[PDB]
């Protein structure tokens, strides 16, 4: 229903099609489709905090055209 952006530290922006009720886990799955990055290797950051997989975009007040920041993890 809406799109959000995911920005890396390397200057790349990824556009995702999402629903307000999508979980962070599902967002990470969508990033895997675009980038090939497994969800366990993704840290997503918004409003100065790392996002937990079980909550939704709505729970974190992530709205249409918001930008998340992606950092890889090991």
């Amino acid at each position: 229903s809406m799109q959000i952006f995911v920005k890396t530290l390397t200057g790349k922006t990824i556009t995702l099609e999402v629903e307000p009720s999508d979980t962070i886990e599902n967002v990470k799955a969508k990033i895997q489709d675009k980038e090939g990055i497994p969800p366990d290797q993704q840290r997503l950051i918004f409003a100065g905090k790392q996002l937990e997989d079980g909550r939704t975009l709505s729970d974190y007040n992530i709205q249409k055209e918001s930008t998340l920041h992606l950092v890889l993890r090991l």
Partner: peptide, 20 residues
């Protein structure tokens, strides 16, 4: 690798706070 990750986390946190 581990210290690079921790600094990258800090940078993303700061970039996301500045945008808020």
């Amino acid at each position: 690798e581990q210290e690079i990750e921790e600094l990258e986390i800090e940078i993303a946190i700061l970039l996301s706070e500045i945008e808020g």
